[PDB]
Design a protein around this nucleic acid. Sequence first.
DNA 1: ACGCTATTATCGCTATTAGT
DNA 2: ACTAATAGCGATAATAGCGT
Lengths: 75, 76
Amino acid sequence: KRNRIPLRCTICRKRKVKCDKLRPHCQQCTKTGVAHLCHYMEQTWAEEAEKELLKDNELKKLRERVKSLEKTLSK
Amino acid sequence: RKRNRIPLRCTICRKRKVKCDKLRPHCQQCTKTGVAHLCHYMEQTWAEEAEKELLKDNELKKLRERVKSLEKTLSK
DNA sequence: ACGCTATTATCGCTATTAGT
DNA sequence: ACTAATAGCGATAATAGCGT
Ligand SMILES: [Zn+2]
Ligand SMILES: [Zn+2]
Ligand SMILES: [Zn+2]
Ligand SMILES: [Zn+2]
Ligand SMILES: [Zn+2]
């Protein structure tokens, strides 16, 4: 009774095919016209990793945004 | 109880309890399982990375709240 | 696009380093 | 010495991928 989460994107895991786990979307989906419906299930061991990947990306965006917002604010 | 050792196996490998070929920028274990954008090697102690992340956290909360406030102001 | 087999990854458990 | 902290193997559970 182990906990294994698919490493293939959920689309072409359903297709029971070979997933080139490319990110954000595997070539296999990109080719069958569904690039952006391609996503990978969350692993328990990539928790911290994934949460910091989000924190990182947000501080970055939030930073460049405060700038633009406050130049706008110049009425 | 004190931890002064900075691991040589990427963090994902530690988490996954496996062997890291310790290559850069990302170990091959991660590349094979497809989670390379998540591979990272500790450059600091756990307690140092923890504090560092805590402060990053606070900046996030204030920046988001500052962005929101500046967003509301913009009604007209 | 799917039954079936091949190949892989989870986690208890064994083993090694080092704090006190 | 005693044991937490750390590293990692390996049997086996469970997913990966083939060919159609
Ligand atoms: Zn795929
Ligand atoms: Zn997309
Ligand atoms: Zn896909
Ligand atoms: Zn690794
Ligand atoms: Zn790695």
